[PDB]
Amino acid sequence: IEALPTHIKAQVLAEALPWLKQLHGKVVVVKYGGNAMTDDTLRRAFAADMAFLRNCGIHPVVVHGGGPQITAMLRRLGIEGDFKGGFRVTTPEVLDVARMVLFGQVGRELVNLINAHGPYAVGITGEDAQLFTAVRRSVTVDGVATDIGLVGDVDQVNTAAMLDLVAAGRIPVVSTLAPDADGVVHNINADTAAAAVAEALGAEKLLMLTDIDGLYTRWPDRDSLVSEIDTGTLAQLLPTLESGMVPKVEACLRAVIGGVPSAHIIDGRVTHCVLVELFTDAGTGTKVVRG
Amino acid sequence: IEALPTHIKAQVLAEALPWLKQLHGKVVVVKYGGNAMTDDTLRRAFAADMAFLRNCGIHPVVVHGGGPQITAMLRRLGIEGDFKGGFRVTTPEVLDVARMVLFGQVGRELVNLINAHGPYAVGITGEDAQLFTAVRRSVTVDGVATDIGLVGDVDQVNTAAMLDLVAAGRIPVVSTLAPDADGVVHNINADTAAAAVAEALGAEKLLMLTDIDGLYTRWPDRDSLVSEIDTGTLAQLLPTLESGMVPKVEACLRAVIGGVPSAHIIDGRVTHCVLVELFTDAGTGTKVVRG
Amino acid sequence: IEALPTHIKAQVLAEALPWLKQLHGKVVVVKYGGNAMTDDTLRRAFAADMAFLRNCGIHPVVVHGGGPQITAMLRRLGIEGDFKGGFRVTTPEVLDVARMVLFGQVGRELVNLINAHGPYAVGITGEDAQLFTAVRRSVTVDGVATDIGLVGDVDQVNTAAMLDLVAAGRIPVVSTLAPDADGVVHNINADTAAAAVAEALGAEKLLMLTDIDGLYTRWPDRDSLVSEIDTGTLAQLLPTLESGMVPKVEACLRAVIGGVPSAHIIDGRVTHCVLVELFTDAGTGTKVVRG
Amino acid sequence: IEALPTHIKAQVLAEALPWLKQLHGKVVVVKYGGNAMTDDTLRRAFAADMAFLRNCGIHPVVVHGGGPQITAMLRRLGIEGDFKGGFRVTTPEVLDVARMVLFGQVGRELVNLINAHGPYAVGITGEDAQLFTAVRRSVTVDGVATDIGLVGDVDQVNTAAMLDLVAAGRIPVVSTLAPDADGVVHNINADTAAAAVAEALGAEKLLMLTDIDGLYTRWPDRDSLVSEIDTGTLAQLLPTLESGMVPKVEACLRAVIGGVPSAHIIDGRVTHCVLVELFTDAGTGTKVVRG
Amino acid sequence: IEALPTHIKAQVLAEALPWLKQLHGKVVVVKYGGNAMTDDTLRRAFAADMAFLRNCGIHPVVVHGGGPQITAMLRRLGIEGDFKGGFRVTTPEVLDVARMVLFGQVGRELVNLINAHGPYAVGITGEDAQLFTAVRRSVTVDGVATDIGLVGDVDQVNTAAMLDLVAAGRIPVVSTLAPDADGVVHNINADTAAAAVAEALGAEKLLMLTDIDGLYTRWPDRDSLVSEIDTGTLAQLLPTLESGMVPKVEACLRAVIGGVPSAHIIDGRVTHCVLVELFTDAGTGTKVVRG
Amino acid sequence: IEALPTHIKAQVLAEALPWLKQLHGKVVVVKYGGNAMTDDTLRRAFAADMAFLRNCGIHPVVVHGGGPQITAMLRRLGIEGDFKGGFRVTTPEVLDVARMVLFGQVGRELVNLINAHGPYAVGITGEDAQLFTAVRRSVTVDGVATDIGLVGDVDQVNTAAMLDLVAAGRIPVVSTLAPDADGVVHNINADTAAAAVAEALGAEKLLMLTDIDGLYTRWPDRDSLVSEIDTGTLAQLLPTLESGMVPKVEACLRAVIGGVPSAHIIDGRVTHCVLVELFTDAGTGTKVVRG
């Protein structure tokens, strides 16, 4: 990287100015998962990029998943699953495992990776200071809406408390668990939690890290890849996409329709992906605006 | 409780005034463990008392243990122990289990019990916002100081950040884990962590919940129980007491010598023990002052 | 009080939590008079209870009367009265005596009793910093509304200035005297002044200390005593009650209709009456809500 | 006043600039008494001048006396005096009269005169918010220091609380009464109280209103009048001056030696005397500096 | 000035109180030009009066012209003029000269005259911190609206930023130059700029310094001079007045119709004119109210 | 710039993190002159880089020169020079020209270039709000220290006021002119002014833009170029360097000895030079530390 003339190193920095302006003082919610969370070089770059935003006056909020890690701990504990449709039923036993894996294992790794750059990361759930609540969600198996345990969606967000925390210069690492109105803790899907935090906080952008290049209209036509698209078009397309892509697209529609200016689906296997997506017009992701 | 004349209900309240004065606006560090943490009625009373302090203008900080719960999870994970002396060696595998049990299981229960009274409890470790660090500790087996893994003592405390958090009206539930100066996370003994937080924050009192009536000089002489004692006397007695009582007495000496006005050893099996100890001259505990 | 087991001393404290919650950070206006002001043990308890509220994060405001003490000073000064109906006419001579007795004698005793617990009590009238104004009031003698001098009702309250004073941690002891819109000072009935301050400040409760057990519907039927009642019912009953009880009932209706959540009539001859009424379900008083 | 050319009205205003500069944002303690307090035109001018300072960004504090008015009320109450030397003995009966006359009569008139210009004046004693304390003083009769009751000198001043009050834009009208360290209220000589408040608050000037032209070295030599003098000279002269002038000169020495830049003795029978003394080089008073 | 009795020096000061009240904490915009800017004694008095307002808690803002000085510098630079109607065309060359003369010569003299009294004056244009913008203006020559270069009127004012600057205790000396919406700097007529700043800031008064006694209805009838007049009357008269008086009258109408309580035309050849106009009923100027 | 893989665009951004950390929240004083000020592309890049720092949470302060532009305006005004040694004598006539050229021409261009990115730049001299003072300086011609008019060096800096201005988010563009202790304005050499502002404000870095590659020990030996050097070494070398380089080297020694961590001499003819020097290890400049 040092055999490259310094006069174009400069032009790469200078070309970040327009996006430093539009994001200075704003909130960016980043959903974090996939290979970016499982590979160690990608992990360290993600943490470094969170430090970058924070030392630019941008306000990142990180919402993380960790579905496979829950599964692995349940197998190690010999906890037998129940499966309606293709969904595991979240018993009280499964929730305590979900909670301790997400908040006491996965969030801790991220907190410590970011905190190698300074006192920034703080781990939280909806349980802490009552930052958000959950409402229990049913799921449609074949054609019947059916119960699958203590699983929910974000109900209300303590917008005020959350923005205080970010104004103190802290990067909130969020594990998606929250009490319902009776104090019983549910597990929320991280993709939807991210979209609801973005809307609640008036984020400028929602970033969805994914193990893909971007949205393909008719996969696997290599040139069905789009780089921008609006909600109306996207919504009519959602019933056709692979099961993997649905949660990320639903999050982007809920967010952008909820008034977040743009949601982005970017390639988590690219080192420093959020740097390229935010401060560079070379991003391979796909941007969602309203229309 | 309703067959008791109201004119002495009044005198019990009125008799709390002198201690409401001395504690208004001060910090009280409470170490939490034992039956008070394992019995459900005692648990709910402890949470309610934390809410009490907070709605009186007092600033509680809770430091919690959970040694037996770590042991149970290691047995469920089939993780074989190594034991030097009578100490388990904390490998990197054992630490991750310690961390997820303490912060993702034990702290969560307390957070949610306190949060039934309002947005007060927040869960933290030394990892979060760099609130404190650990320095690795050796242990003396027979007569040789020996390594027993990633176990340490509190090195530095971010006093400033911690008192900001308590001034925002938050009750910090602390899990005793912290990075060393190289970012490697150790497990700290909860009794000593409590004493170091008390000293760092200029707490007015340190409360040590214990499954005993109080300090017995020559157990089990029933009338060797003391209700007050100073550090010089206590120190000369420490080499004689049962192995259970040493950690709590060492915490009280480090705290009170460090300038905390009084440390108290109180009976955690008594419902609402911190209420009786703080707002009543009928406490059965034992108070430690300097001399 | 020390021959009573400590395990129920605890339950009395613990049972104060629900009311500590509802009152934390709120304003409580207390009208003060009767035997609670003339007996020295009751006086000291009242002062101690004001200190209690203030060291709990509650914001008391004290409005006091002192009609008999004015009368005694007029007799000592040999000032002859004029009486229309059964009302003394407040000449400029009588007002100066009222003013100096209320503010320079009665308020001073209360200020000093409260200030034995700390720097809390401050004495004020409507004259000071223009905290409130009076509008002259006529009175109906037999059937003719007639003038009886410089006597009035509270016209406007400097809500902003008053809540600044209480936010600085000060307990305002209020003597009910205020200038009209021309700067001429009137004497306001303490019961009505209390109700208007409660409404102006958005108090959570109005407490009216009285030398009775509570409201009796058809005195002296011992079991016509009510413990709760709403405004509509109470209003239809006001024309039947003894002359003593009318001022306190009118204050409660004006207050609760003005949006104060509850007004209470409590027994001032009970030591620590405001403690029992606020932090105990054993209060003998009577509560007024709207309906 | 309207038959005077406007071009010299201007020069009188313009000539106030140097003293507006030196006093902007500073504290001026004014002792108030004599004819300036007994004549109604002088009273109204004094109040108007307090409003002037406050609408210039200057911070006045008024300390007032009222010895003759106490005497008149004692005669009206038929309270027989005791006199050691030429001093009335302040019994508990005399103190309550002193207190109610000073705070409930004399201070009220001043509060209301100033408050015709806006929400500025607030009445206070040392009793209120614990603003200052008194220590009992003995007096030397002939040659024996003798007790003369509950009379004292200012012991400690709550400097912090007092300057908060003045920073909120309030003019403190101070009645000189304060509790000793046991809570018993004494009456303090207003001249000395003024000097101790000036020193405690770091006032820029102390103004002592007096019924004289200024300090005469050898009264009644008409040209023994001085307009400036330092403490060392003044101190050596104090044993020679009429009994009336001693209290005001002692106040000026205690103040200026205590580090108040200048104390002034000015003619209270001159309408708007503090205006001429502060914003005009034509003052007839006498200035005291240290040397 | 010292052969004049001190008892009427006092009455001149005292008579300023009503206007010190109405202006305390308010903004006064003063347009500055004419002999008051060219004579050195008048200049020093104007600066001293700005210091006066600032040490009274009043908030002056100074808008200055300097048309003749621009003309002189253009002649010294040998820059040939173009004149449509009787208007110089402001080329890019003329604007740079206007800008450097107004901001680097004329404003500097005023800044330094005021700053002899303390750290108050700060020089600004619309270019600085984007305090205001200009929109290009056409002019009507004979009957055809024609271009005369980079000359404009104030478009938008950064009200928020401007009032921050004045709240920090700074006297803004404003040179009337501002960018249009494309960043090209125009020269704004100082009279109209003053009126637009007054309206934008919610000034209490607009002062227009002028080389006349005041408004004459039918000049030169000596007794056609008015001392007060409303907008409706004034507007119907504007088409009749000498060319010199039109800009100042248009500013007063735009200001007062825009809700500034009064605009004043005062005699800049009178030493300390703003002192006489603000704190004296002897002003020779003319006051404009709405009607 | 778009034919370059995005995976190394990322690495250039990521490599800025260490310097974003060290500079976040710090002050950087930049001396601005030479071709960077005379070429329009370099000018626009410099302005854009000031916007960059400000949208990263860094606090730039710009000190500018303009010697040749003063000379050109004096020739256009036909003002004959006097020259002692090789120095122009700054008469009162020359100073007014210096002042209006620097503050009303040169500073304005920079203010407007930066303000195309937002409300950041504000133009100031020592005259404004008394931000700094000058002390007159003599110069040594041959061997005799001789007067050369109103030329000086920075005497005192209003550190407090200056850091308030930068904390409000403003980029101070400083023209080097200041009053002496008598209010007479001098012209200060921009290089030395920059060094004194850096020291007064506790800047983290001083940047000196220069038309050279860096410091050459024995020019023109191409490989006598150094990239780092300490004060002791540099000082012993100063008597040997070309006349052009002396002012910049003296500024770096005064600054770094005054406790500024590093001063840098960088190539102003390189587009975006401050970006390469601050966020890139490829800078061609030379760094000065203390030793």
Ligand SMILES: Oc1ccccc1-c1ccno1
């Ligand atoms: O959990 C925290 C850790 C450090 C600092 C603040 C917090 C926090 C989380 C929610 N409110 O405050």
Ligand SMILES: Oc1ccccc1-c1ccno1
């Ligand atoms: O009267 C007072 C005494 C002490 C502190 C504040 C006050 C006060 C009363 C009204 N505004 O301020």
Ligand SMILES: Oc1ccccc1-c1ccno1
């Ligand atoms: O230009 C200034 C000089 C000193 C202090 C403040 C300012 C200023 C002008 C606009 N915003 O801030």
